[PDB]
């Protein structure tokens, strides 16, 4: 989680009057020819609150990350209250997009970013360049890492079937129909690795073949 200690230090650095009890963070990721997916995470008292995570889809073939951030802010905060602090995955451009959107809808909350390449902190139209091991820098990196983790999970079910298939393709002498029965039943490698020999065997009608699946898993 985010250290209460470090949350306190963050409040000082950003000159916040209020403790950052609720922090929301945004990742912007684009799927070419389809849409931008904005993934929103929530920390409450420094802990992830996974039930409150949300995504926003902005339909467009080509990325426009600043307009995407603007759209997210207007969509979300027309419905939800503002957090104590909003984190954006990026620097001056991203931070300013969020601030200007907030101004548009008559709302006000602190917005902080982390430059993508330099790990510079962006706040109130300034860069703050901290030493690498500064606790506030580490805290913001933790937020960024959770926004990324949630973002990457948009692809999960697809990625998982594909990785399951790849591992099964090294099982000698199992045909495509049985491999597909396994993929449809288990969905992923983690899932089929929690399964008994008997369970695997029942799905494909063969203990001989299920033993070999277990060998190669
Ligand atoms: Cl929410
Ligand atoms: Cl909602
Ligand atoms: Cl960290
Ligand atoms: Cl998808
Ligand atoms: Cl096939």
mmCIF file of C-alpha atoms and ligand atoms in Angstrom:
data_model
loop_
_atom_site.group_PDB
_atom_site.id
_atom_site.type_symbol
_atom_site.label_atom_id
_atom_site.label_comp_id
_atom_site.label_asym_id
_atom_site.label_seq_id
_atom_site.Cartn_x
_atom_site.Cartn_y
_atom_site.Cartn_z
ATOM 1 C CA UNK A 1 0.000 0.000 0.000
ATOM 2 C CA UNK A 2 0.933 3.650 0.098
ATOM 3 C CA UNK A 3 2.744 4.415 3.334
ATOM 4 C CA UNK A 4 0.806 6.773 5.674
ATOM 5 C CA UNK A 5 4.178 8.212 6.423
ATOM 6 C CA UNK A 6 4.706 8.914 2.673
ATOM 7 C CA UNK A 7 1.134 10.185 2.185
ATOM 8 C CA UNK A 8 1.959 12.741 4.867
ATOM 9 C CA UNK A 9 5.107 13.721 3.015
ATOM 10 C CA UNK A 10 3.112 14.023 -0.246
ATOM 11 C CA UNK A 11 0.576 16.340 1.383
ATOM 12 C CA UNK A 12 3.474 18.634 2.438
ATOM 13 C CA UNK A 13 5.136 18.600 -1.000
ATOM 14 C CA UNK A 14 1.911 19.581 -2.819
ATOM 15 C CA UNK A 15 0.889 21.987 -0.015
ATOM 16 C CA UNK A 16 -2.449 20.219 0.361
ATOM 17 C CA UNK A 17 -4.619 21.345 3.231
ATOM 18 C CA UNK A 18 -6.422 17.963 3.271
ATOM 19 C CA UNK A 19 -4.945 14.457 3.829
ATOM 20 C CA UNK A 20 -5.013 12.508 0.518
ATOM 21 C CA UNK A 21 -7.543 9.969 1.811
ATOM 22 C CA UNK A 22 -8.932 9.229 -1.659
ATOM 23 C CA UNK A 23 -6.573 9.262 -4.601
ATOM 24 C CA UNK A 24 -7.667 8.394 -8.134
ATOM 25 C CA UNK A 25 -5.184 7.637 -10.927
ATOM 26 C CA UNK A 26 -5.552 7.486 -14.690
ATOM 27 C CA UNK A 27 -3.731 5.450 -17.363
ATOM 28 C CA UNK A 28 -4.378 6.331 -21.032
ATOM 29 C CA UNK A 29 -3.768 3.468 -23.472
ATOM 30 C CA UNK A 30 -4.762 3.431 -27.114
ATOM 31 C CA UNK A 31 -5.956 0.577 -29.300
ATOM 32 C CA UNK A 32 -5.161 1.601 -32.828
ATOM 33 C CA UNK A 33 -8.167 1.753 -35.166
ATOM 34 C CA UNK A 34 -10.548 1.276 -32.245
ATOM 35 C CA UNK A 35 -10.484 3.438 -29.150
ATOM 36 C CA UNK A 36 -8.525 4.843 -26.246
ATOM 37 C CA UNK A 37 -9.062 2.991 -22.970
ATOM 38 C CA UNK A 38 -8.686 5.173 -19.876
ATOM 39 C CA UNK A 39 -8.239 3.013 -16.775
ATOM 40 C CA UNK A 40 -8.988 4.546 -13.398
ATOM 41 C CA UNK A 41 -7.736 3.239 -10.091
ATOM 42 C CA UNK A 42 -8.720 4.226 -6.570
ATOM 43 C CA UNK A 43 -6.660 4.274 -3.351
ATOM 44 C CA UNK A 44 -8.511 4.772 -0.080
ATOM 45 C CA UNK A 45 -6.293 5.517 2.941
ATOM 46 C CA UNK A 46 -3.399 4.286 0.848
ATOM 47 C CA UNK A 47 -4.975 0.984 -0.145
ATOM 48 C CA UNK A 48 -6.365 -0.132 -3.465
ATOM 49 C CA UNK A 49 -10.152 -0.190 -3.557
ATOM 50 C CA UNK A 50 -10.653 -2.532 -6.493
ATOM 51 C CA UNK A 51 -14.485 -2.368 -6.458
ATOM 52 C CA UNK A 52 -14.339 1.286 -7.392
ATOM 53 C CA UNK A 53 -11.984 0.878 -10.409
ATOM 54 C CA UNK A 54 -13.497 1.959 -13.738
ATOM 55 C CA UNK A 55 -12.649 2.347 -17.384
ATOM 56 C CA UNK A 56 -13.680 4.904 -19.981
ATOM 57 C CA UNK A 57 -13.568 4.285 -23.725
ATOM 58 C CA UNK A 58 -13.004 7.146 -26.174
ATOM 59 C CA UNK A 59 -13.793 6.028 -29.711
ATOM 60 C CA UNK A 60 -11.233 7.241 -32.248
ATOM 61 C CA UNK A 61 -8.820 5.500 -34.614
ATOM 62 C CA UNK A 62 -5.819 7.613 -33.661
ATOM 63 C CA UNK A 63 -4.677 8.654 -30.178
ATOM 64 C CA UNK A 64 -5.321 12.044 -28.723
ATOM 65 C CA UNK A 65 -4.224 11.641 -25.137
ATOM 66 C CA UNK A 66 -4.881 15.206 -23.980
ATOM 67 C CA UNK A 67 -8.430 15.144 -25.359
ATOM 68 C CA UNK A 68 -8.888 11.681 -23.843
ATOM 69 C CA UNK A 69 -7.904 12.944 -20.388
ATOM 70 C CA UNK A 70 -10.319 15.893 -20.798
ATOM 71 C CA UNK A 71 -13.142 13.526 -21.763
ATOM 72 C CA UNK A 72 -12.485 11.191 -18.847
ATOM 73 C CA UNK A 73 -12.526 14.025 -16.335
ATOM 74 C CA UNK A 74 -15.783 15.428 -17.638
ATOM 75 C CA UNK A 75 -17.466 12.039 -17.898
ATOM 76 C CA UNK A 76 -16.401 10.812 -14.498
ATOM 77 C CA UNK A 77 -16.728 13.906 -12.360
ATOM 78 C CA UNK A 78 -20.150 14.782 -13.785
ATOM 79 C CA UNK A 79 -21.266 11.664 -11.865
ATOM 80 C CA UNK A 80 -18.731 10.960 -9.115
ATOM 81 C CA UNK A 81 -17.349 13.205 -6.437
ATOM 82 C CA UNK A 82 -13.835 14.433 -6.759
ATOM 83 C CA UNK A 83 -11.050 12.626 -4.928
ATOM 84 C CA UNK A 84 -8.663 14.439 -2.618
ATOM 85 C CA UNK A 85 -5.997 14.039 -5.313
ATOM 86 C CA UNK A 86 -5.968 13.050 -8.989
ATOM 87 C CA UNK A 87 -2.902 11.356 -10.446
ATOM 88 C CA UNK A 88 -2.226 11.374 -14.191
ATOM 89 C CA UNK A 89 0.350 9.174 -15.861
ATOM 90 C CA UNK A 90 2.336 11.894 -17.586
ATOM 91 C CA UNK A 91 3.748 15.368 -17.331
ATOM 92 C CA UNK A 92 2.824 18.959 -17.963
ATOM 93 C CA UNK A 93 0.598 18.252 -20.977
ATOM 94 C CA UNK A 94 -1.453 15.580 -19.270
ATOM 95 C CA UNK A 95 -1.744 17.466 -15.964
ATOM 96 C CA UNK A 96 -2.833 20.617 -17.695
ATOM 97 C CA UNK A 97 -5.446 18.741 -19.744
ATOM 98 C CA UNK A 98 -7.020 17.497 -16.498
ATOM 99 C CA UNK A 99 -6.912 20.892 -14.785
ATOM 100 C CA UNK A 100 -8.524 22.648 -17.722
ATOM 101 C CA UNK A 101 -11.273 20.020 -17.889
ATOM 102 C CA UNK A 102 -11.923 20.417 -14.169
ATOM 103 C CA UNK A 103 -12.179 24.191 -14.635
ATOM 104 C CA UNK A 104 -14.725 23.605 -17.411
ATOM 105 C CA UNK A 105 -17.120 21.655 -15.224
ATOM 106 C CA UNK A 106 -16.665 24.013 -12.248
ATOM 107 C CA UNK A 107 -14.692 21.565 -10.091
ATOM 108 C CA UNK A 108 -11.416 21.876 -8.210
ATOM 109 C CA UNK A 109 -9.016 19.267 -6.902
ATOM 110 C CA UNK A 110 -5.255 18.929 -6.876
ATOM 111 C CA UNK A 111 -3.776 17.151 -9.909
ATOM 112 C CA UNK A 112 -0.299 15.590 -9.874
ATOM 113 C CA UNK A 113 1.618 13.825 -12.579
ATOM 114 C CA UNK A 114 4.777 11.885 -13.096
ATOM 115 C CA UNK A 115 6.656 12.451 -16.316
ATOM 116 C CA UNK A 116 6.815 9.185 -18.193
ATOM 117 C CA UNK A 117 10.577 9.073 -18.958
ATOM 118 C CA UNK A 118 12.212 11.249 -16.256
ATOM 119 C CA UNK A 119 10.072 10.475 -13.222
ATOM 120 C CA UNK A 120 9.838 14.183 -12.607
ATOM 121 C CA UNK A 121 6.815 15.236 -10.492
ATOM 122 C CA UNK A 122 4.445 17.737 -12.151
ATOM 123 C CA UNK A 123 2.266 19.968 -10.051
ATOM 124 C CA UNK A 124 0.851 23.542 -10.350
ATOM 125 C CA UNK A 125 2.543 24.110 -13.682
ATOM 126 C CA UNK A 126 6.004 23.221 -12.370
ATOM 127 C CA UNK A 127 8.328 20.270 -12.545
ATOM 128 C CA UNK A 128 9.768 19.048 -9.218
ATOM 129 C CA UNK A 129 12.910 17.008 -9.737
ATOM 130 C CA UNK A 130 13.403 14.860 -6.597
ATOM 131 C CA UNK A 131 16.304 12.569 -5.704
ATOM 132 C CA UNK A 132 15.700 9.014 -6.946
ATOM 133 C CA UNK A 133 15.023 7.510 -3.529
ATOM 134 C CA UNK A 134 12.746 10.287 -2.278
ATOM 135 C CA UNK A 135 9.708 8.789 -0.509
ATOM 136 C CA UNK A 136 7.233 10.943 -2.465
ATOM 137 C CA UNK A 137 8.744 9.835 -5.713
ATOM 138 C CA UNK A 138 8.463 6.188 -4.602
ATOM 139 C CA UNK A 139 4.841 6.700 -3.611
ATOM 140 C CA UNK A 140 3.960 8.214 -6.979
ATOM 141 C CA UNK A 141 5.700 5.340 -8.758
ATOM 142 C CA UNK A 142 3.553 2.946 -6.730
ATOM 143 C CA UNK A 143 0.432 4.724 -7.971
ATOM 144 C CA UNK A 144 1.680 4.671 -11.537
ATOM 145 C CA UNK A 145 2.470 0.970 -11.275
ATOM 146 C CA UNK A 146 -1.087 0.192 -10.104
ATOM 147 C CA UNK A 147 -2.604 2.281 -12.951
ATOM 148 C CA UNK A 148 -0.461 0.255 -15.353
ATOM 149 C CA UNK A 149 -1.331 -3.068 -13.824
ATOM 150 C CA UNK A 150 -5.035 -2.277 -14.146
ATOM 151 C CA UNK A 151 -4.577 -0.990 -17.672
ATOM 152 C CA UNK A 152 -2.769 -4.122 -18.830
ATOM 153 C CA UNK A 153 -5.564 -6.289 -17.403
ATOM 154 C CA UNK A 154 -7.950 -4.966 -20.079
ATOM 155 C CA UNK A 155 -6.410 -7.645 -22.327
ATOM 156 C CA UNK A 156 -6.429 -10.375 -19.721
ATOM 157 C CA UNK A 157 -8.910 -12.969 -20.959
ATOM 158 C CA UNK A 158 -7.439 -12.832 -24.489
ATOM 159 C CA UNK A 159 -3.783 -12.884 -23.391
ATOM 160 C CA UNK A 160 -4.561 -15.828 -21.089
ATOM 161 C CA UNK A 161 -6.151 -18.036 -23.720
ATOM 162 C CA UNK A 162 -3.251 -17.288 -26.068
ATOM 163 C CA UNK A 163 -0.624 -18.187 -23.444
ATOM 164 C CA UNK A 164 -2.550 -21.395 -22.470
ATOM 165 C CA UNK A 165 -2.649 -22.413 -26.155
ATOM 166 C CA UNK A 166 1.104 -21.864 -26.582
ATOM 167 C CA UNK A 167 1.926 -24.118 -23.598
ATOM 168 C CA UNK A 168 -0.543 -26.827 -24.731
ATOM 169 C CA UNK A 169 1.045 -26.818 -28.201
ATOM 170 C CA UNK A 170 4.126 -28.448 -26.621
ATOM 171 C CA UNK A 171 2.066 -31.418 -25.367
ATOM 172 C CA UNK A 172 2.820 -34.295 -27.669
ATOM 173 C CA UNK A 173 -0.086 -36.122 -29.302
ATOM 174 C CA UNK A 174 -2.998 -33.948 -28.245
ATOM 175 C CA UNK A 175 -5.044 -32.763 -31.210
ATOM 176 C CA UNK A 176 -6.701 -29.401 -31.742
ATOM 177 C CA UNK A 177 -10.207 -30.426 -30.609
ATOM 178 C CA UNK A 178 -8.928 -31.586 -27.175
ATOM 179 C CA UNK A 179 -6.680 -28.521 -26.807
ATOM 180 C CA UNK A 180 -9.672 -26.329 -27.495
ATOM 181 C CA UNK A 181 -11.831 -28.192 -24.989
ATOM 182 C CA UNK A 182 -9.127 -27.437 -22.412
ATOM 183 C CA UNK A 183 -8.898 -23.757 -23.333
ATOM 184 C CA UNK A 184 -12.662 -23.356 -23.187
ATOM 185 C CA UNK A 185 -12.965 -25.143 -19.832
ATOM 186 C CA UNK A 186 -9.932 -23.740 -17.990
ATOM 187 C CA UNK A 187 -9.387 -20.389 -19.770
ATOM 188 C CA UNK A 188 -5.853 -19.878 -18.474
ATOM 189 C CA UNK A 189 -2.559 -21.465 -17.321
ATOM 190 C CA UNK A 190 -3.071 -20.520 -13.683
ATOM 191 C CA UNK A 191 -6.455 -22.267 -13.813
ATOM 192 C CA UNK A 192 -5.292 -25.495 -15.413
ATOM 193 C CA UNK A 193 -2.298 -25.567 -13.022
ATOM 194 C CA UNK A 194 -4.743 -25.663 -10.092
ATOM 195 C CA UNK A 195 -6.520 -28.693 -11.635
ATOM 196 C CA UNK A 196 -6.260 -32.411 -10.727
ATOM 197 C CA UNK A 197 -5.231 -35.113 -13.198
ATOM 198 C CA UNK A 198 -8.782 -36.429 -12.985
ATOM 199 C CA UNK A 199 -10.289 -33.030 -13.698
ATOM 200 C CA UNK A 200 -8.113 -32.527 -16.783
ATOM 201 C CA UNK A 201 -8.750 -36.116 -17.916
ATOM 202 C CA UNK A 202 -12.528 -35.775 -17.622
ATOM 203 C CA UNK A 203 -12.502 -32.689 -19.851
ATOM 204 C CA UNK A 204 -10.699 -34.471 -22.735
ATOM 205 C CA UNK A 205 -11.735 -38.080 -22.106
ATOM 206 C CA UNK A 206 -8.189 -39.315 -21.609
ATOM 207 C CA UNK A 207 -6.014 -39.768 -18.569
ATOM 208 C CA UNK A 208 -3.066 -40.683 -20.829
ATOM 209 C CA UNK A 209 -3.254 -37.333 -22.554
ATOM 210 C CA UNK A 210 -4.051 -35.504 -19.239
ATOM 211 C CA UNK A 211 -0.832 -36.983 -17.662
ATOM 212 C CA UNK A 212 1.170 -35.430 -20.478
ATOM 213 C CA UNK A 213 -0.511 -32.080 -20.069
ATOM 214 C CA UNK A 214 0.558 -32.225 -16.413
ATOM 215 C CA UNK A 215 4.140 -33.171 -17.402
ATOM 216 C CA UNK A 216 4.566 -30.167 -19.651
ATOM 217 C CA UNK A 217 2.703 -27.700 -17.322
HETATM 218 CL CL1 LIG B 1 -15.444 4.708 -9.100
HETATM 219 CL CL1 LIG B 2 -19.839 4.157 -12.015
HETATM 220 CL CL1 LIG B 3 7.790 2.645 -5.810
HETATM 221 CL CL1 LIG B 4 -10.408 -6.283 -25.276
HETATM 222 CL CL1 LIG B 5 -6.686 -25.316 -33.891
#
